[PDB]
Design a protein around this ligand. Sequence first.
Ligand SMILES: C[S@@+](CC[C@H](N)C(=O)[O-])C[C@H]1O[C@@H](n2cnc3c(N)ncnc32)[C@H](O)[C@@H]1O
Length: 283
Amino acid sequence: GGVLQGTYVDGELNGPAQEYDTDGRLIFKGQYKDNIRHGVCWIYYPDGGSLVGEVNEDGEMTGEKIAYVYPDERTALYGKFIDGEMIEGKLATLMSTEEGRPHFELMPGNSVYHFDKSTSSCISTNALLPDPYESERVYVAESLISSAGEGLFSKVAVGPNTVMSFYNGVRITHQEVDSRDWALNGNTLSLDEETVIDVPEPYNHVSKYCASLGHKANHSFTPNCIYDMFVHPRFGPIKCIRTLRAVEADEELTVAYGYSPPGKSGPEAPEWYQVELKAFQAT
Ligand SMILES: C[S@@+](CC[C@H](N)C(=O)[O-])C[C@H]1O[C@@H](n2cnc3c(N)ncnc32)[C@H](O)[C@@H]1O
């Protein structure tokens, strides 16, 4: 599936090439040499992020100068990667692109980021190491909504379809979430058919966990954001918060929580939600 526009020299791929996904989105741009990815290549993710760097002998993203670039196409985690996996990335800025080749400038400080996919019990190896892309776009504060605890706010004005925050957390089964005390489900977010993401009790406090902040976004029936899929260099496959339209600086980010046909919709919706739902219906 999907098209691969290539340059061939006697049977094998040799020269520039560009690949697209079934949807016609550019997922790869670079070149091949004897049917193998060669030189500085770019891998583009559906969510807007990407991988770029001097590929190795086997055509993979393995090197000491590989980089993951966030959706703003400016914030980057530059460093050591093995076959696309971030082993030791340092915060940097993509200054410019010279003939397809990127130029990175490290940011002050030597914090190291690495692939650290959560487990059912470990949410992160550095719960208090913030996400640099998040630090630029959002902040947590008392929600403008009444009796709704903390909310998530935009630091600057941005347009529609902008990735603002990441929803990372421990990974557990739907079975476990549907069968346990529902009072423990305030932060559960369905990732897919087999995994639910949760930011369990202790970590729901910014003073204990600030690696991602998506779980701080409150609900609204007229939301300005939606939950979207995201492949993070550090968190791995998770969900993120993306704007549905332009948002002002200091505007509160909200999303419509998921509450399918009767029965096949899992646990009942919280009391606060049901209340607002009625108040909303025929507002
Ligand atoms: C995913 S958290 C969002 C952040 C949370 N308010 C906090 O301070 O950490 C979900 C919880 O926030 C509250 N919440 C979200 N949207 C709300 C709303 N519209 N009205 C009241 N409470 C809301 C309730 O306790 C709820 O279960």
